């Protein structure tokens, strides 16, 4: 299962100034980038066009180009409409895309956050507020739902274009999607012991402190941290009394190793 996500971030500092920036992800790989500064969407992979022809892509990009300008003026008008209830600075985020399942199956979504809170989604044939949303949003919802052309376009994007596109991406990027990159580990301590694991792809990983045959209860896995080359980094810590270092090993299991675990004794 892969999730494809188009993430749009828009800031509106006042009546005149705004910028919109987007990135696109397929699982944990970036496929597209669209900076406010740029007229065109950039591919961040050789396979980012998926199985679309040049004509189909140029057409699709053109529609997004117009959308970015339309979105910007629609927010600014929506603010004037709510005035003085809401004012600048405003932050809007959109998360749109689809999750692909085995076979012919998928689910699409279009979630909207206002000032960092999820308030609105497209669902079925219309926009709706989600539970916990403030009631003033009902006027913008009513206004957005008056726009039949937008509704038909969004239904087509979510129901057809998105899954079709992603299926093409999955075939074109198979090689990169299924890359295996080997971790490299190293050890240190602070006045607790640390097993550093870096360079691995994909994400699933197993890091445990061992004394011989026996796994240590106390091992504390840190968060997964990214590297710039699209591999992952993780640390596992273990607190011990000083003097008890001797005979502890760090053990790492990862798909890339072909079952030859990394084993590092202190």
């Amino acid at each position, epitope marked *: 299962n892969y999730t494809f996500r188009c993430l749009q971030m828009s800031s509106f500092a006042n009546r005149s100034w705004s910028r919109t920036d987007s990135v696109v992800w397929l699982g944990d790989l970036q496929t597209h980038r669209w900076s406010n500064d740029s007229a065109t969407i950039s591919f961040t992979k050789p396979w980012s066009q998926g199985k679309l022809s040049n004509q189909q892509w140029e057409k699709l990009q053109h529609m997004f180009q*117009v959308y970015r300008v*339309s979105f910007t*003026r*629609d927010i600014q*008008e*929506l603010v*004037k*409409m709510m*005035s003085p209830k809401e004012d600048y600075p405003i932050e809007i985020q959109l998360s749109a895309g689809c999750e692909m399942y085995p076979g012919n199956a998928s689910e699409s979504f279009l979630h909207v956050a206002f000032q960092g809170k999820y308030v609105v989604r497209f669902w079925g044939t219309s926009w709706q507020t989600v539970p916990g949303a403030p009631s003033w949003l009902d006027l913008p919802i*009513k*206004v*957005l739902n*008056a*726009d*039949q*052309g*937008t509704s038909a376009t969004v239904q087509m994007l979510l129901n057809d274009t998105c899954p079709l596109f992603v299926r093409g991406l999955l075939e074109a990027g198979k090689s990169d999607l299924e890359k295996q990159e080997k971790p490299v580990a190293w050890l240190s301590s602070v006045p607790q012991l640390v097993c550093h694991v870096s360079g691995f792809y994909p994400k699933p990983v197993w890091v445990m402190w061992m004394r011989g045959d026996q796994e240590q209860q106390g091992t504390h896995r840190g968060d997964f941290l990214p590297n710039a080359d699209e591999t992952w980094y993780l640390q596992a810590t273990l607190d011990v009394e000083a003097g008890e270092e001797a005979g502890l090993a760090c053990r790492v299991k990862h798909s890339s190793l072909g079952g030859q675990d990394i084993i590092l004794y202190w």
Partner: T-cell receptor, first 111, second 113 residues
Framework: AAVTQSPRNKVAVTGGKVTLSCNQT?????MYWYRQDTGHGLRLIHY???????EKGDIPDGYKASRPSQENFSLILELATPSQTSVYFC??????????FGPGTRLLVLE | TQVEQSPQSLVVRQGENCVLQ??????????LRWFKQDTGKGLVSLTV?????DKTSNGRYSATLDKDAKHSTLHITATLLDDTATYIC?????????????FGAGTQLIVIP
């Protein structure tokens, strides 16, 4: 959906105050003021998204707008100038795309 | 000026057909409306076209819209005296009140009785 305008026709002097009113009973949230001059399409001056709201349109200079109630939208020329000689059209609308036009007011500002 | 109409004016004899054109660069283009305005009067809506390729009619009036070409025509079949007026093309850039209207400057028709 019915929109009215008054006055329908007005002769005014440079530097006088002129008020042009528009009334609609459609319970429309939205109201718009345009002027039409020969050689040009209608051009948007001020508009309003409800009572107490007024917003600048494309050519707001020399005009002020007033929206005291759902029903009434006024265009006020605090210091009329000959360049404001024109035909003015008011319109109203709800959330949909249609604007319902008033019948027009002819204004002549003489020196 | 994003909405251009042609011709600027024309004179036709009662009973003759004529065709008026509207070309635009307004983006996006949700709908296109034609208005009739008699001299001294207000705007009467004749038709609105909303589809990618669209056709409408209203008595002796018909209209086409081609959004790919950003081009519309208004056809008046068998003109009458009361057709004397200015015909105005207007493009709405949204399917809601968030939209702005973009007005052509008009085409003036005169019909000879």
């Amino acid at each position: 959906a019915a929109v009215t305008q008054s006055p329908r026709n007005k002769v005014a002097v440079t530097g006088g105050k002129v008020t042009l009113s528009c009334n609609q009973t459609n319970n429309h949230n939205n109201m718009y003021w345009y002027r039409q001059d020969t050689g040009h399409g209608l051009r948007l001056i001020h508009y309003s998204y409800g009572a107490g709201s007024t917003e600048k349109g494309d050519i707001p200079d020399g005009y002020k707008a007033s929206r005291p109630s759902q029903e009434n939208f006024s265009l006020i020329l605090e210091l009329a100038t000959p360049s404001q000689t024109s035909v003015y059209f008011c319109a109203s609308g709800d959330e949909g795309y249609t604007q319902y036009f008033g019948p027009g007011t002819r204004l002549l500002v003489l020196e | 000026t994003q909405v251009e109409q042609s011709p600027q004016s024309l004179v036709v004899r009662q009973g003759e057909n004529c065709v008026l054109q509207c070309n635009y660069s307004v983006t996006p283009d949700n709908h296109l409306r034609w208005f009739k305005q008699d001299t001294g009067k207000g705007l009467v809506s004749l038709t609105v076209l909303v589809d990618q390729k669209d056709k409408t009619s209203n008595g002796r009036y018909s209209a086409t819209l081609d959004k790919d070409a950003k081009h519309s025509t208004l056809h008046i079949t068998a003109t009458l005296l009361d057709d004397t007026a200015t015909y105005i093309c207007v493009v709405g850039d949204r399917g809601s009140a968030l939209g702005r209207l973009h007005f052509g400057a008009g085409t003036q028709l005169i019909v000879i009785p």
